[PDB]
């Protein structure tokens, strides 16, 4: 998974 960024 990847980290949360808008």
């Amino acid at each position, epitope marked *: *998974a*990847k*980290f*949360r*960024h*808008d």
Partner: antibody
Amino acid sequence: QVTLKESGPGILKPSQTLSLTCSFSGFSLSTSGMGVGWIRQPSGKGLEWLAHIWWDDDRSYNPSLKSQLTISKDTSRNQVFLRITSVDTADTATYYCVRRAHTTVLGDWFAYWGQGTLVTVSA
Amino acid sequence: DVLMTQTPLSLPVSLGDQASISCRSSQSIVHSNGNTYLEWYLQKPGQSPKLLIYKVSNRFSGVPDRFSGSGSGTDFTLKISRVEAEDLGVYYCFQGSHVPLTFGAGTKLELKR
């Protein structure tokens, strides 16, 4: 002014549960886009990231430690908690509380760090 | 984990001298949204890490113009044009696009004599 203060037990025995508290101010975790998480650093060693919790209770964990880790929050009290079950001497480290947002305006980066809390795991 | 390899891990320098530190990642650190969350931190003894550079090349608050960052994909560099006394410490690169978030091992910027 933004502040972040970590608290923990100081010394703990192998196999028992570590409970860490971050108490912050100058921002709210109910602000959408906002998140708080944890990073540790063994004395004289590199930094290792642990977990992050978001305004909406989405989290990320370090997958190598996921069976041991539980992150939680109390937005009303300005607190975030980390639980590490059955610790061992390698879990000895300085534990930092850090703020990170997922929007540009709120600061998507590790700008604010607490002074860290030393936890020693020893029998 | 995305390995963050810094070169070198110990960098002696004279004051006034140029310095540069390489950071190469295991995979591309370009996020699904198209940005590259590569950051650089400086940590001094006793103190916690401080943000220097975000999104590859952008100076954070209080960071002098002698500091700069460059790179793309899997290959990054931090530069200091003239090293000063306050610059001495441990520099870490960091990726914040993939889980888990990973720092390199740290680079000691030290003095020459």
